[PDB]
Amino acid sequence: SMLRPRLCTMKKGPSGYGFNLHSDKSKPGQFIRSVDPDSPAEASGLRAQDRIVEVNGVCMEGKQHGDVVSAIRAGGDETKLLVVDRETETSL
Numbered sequence: 076s077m078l079r080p081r082l083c084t085m086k087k088g089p090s091g092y093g094f095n096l097h098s099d100k101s102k103p104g105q106f107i108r109s110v111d112p113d114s115p116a117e118a119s120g121l122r123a124q125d126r127i128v129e130v131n132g133v134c135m136e137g138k139q140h141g142d143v144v145s146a147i148r149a150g151g152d153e154t155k156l157l158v159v160d161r162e163t164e165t166s167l
Contacts (some may be wrong), residue, residue: 076160076161077159077160077161080157080158080159081117081120081125081126081157081158081160082155082156082157082158083119083120083121083155083156083157083158084119084120084153084154084155085115085116085118085121085153085154085155085156086115086152087115087152087153088115088151090111090152091110091112092112092114092115092116093113093115093116093117094107094108094109094110094111094114094116094121095107095108095109096108096127096140096143096144096147097140098139098140099111102143103139104126104127104128104135105126105127105135105140105143106124106125106126106127107121107122107123107124107125107126107127107158108123109123110122110123119156121127121156121158122160123154124160125142125158125159125160125162126158126159126160127156127157127158128157128158128159128163129155129156129157130143130146130147130150130154130155130156130157131146131149131150131154131155132155132157133146
């Protein structure tokens, strides 16, 4: 598990970025379902099960699937995803 969030910077190719984003039925946030081989997303270091915490420097906390997709699309042909790979908050 990473010690700090990772910034994954990518430019679209002919097939887009090359990842699938999805909601989880049991926990909040938007997660990378898959990363295509030989894609911009793969080259950026993005991995399956990463959770998006920022898009282009904007906090995605509380944002639903469509709002995160919109934020990604709004950046045009490039995106910068700040991601984590584990839970970062717990109520006790």
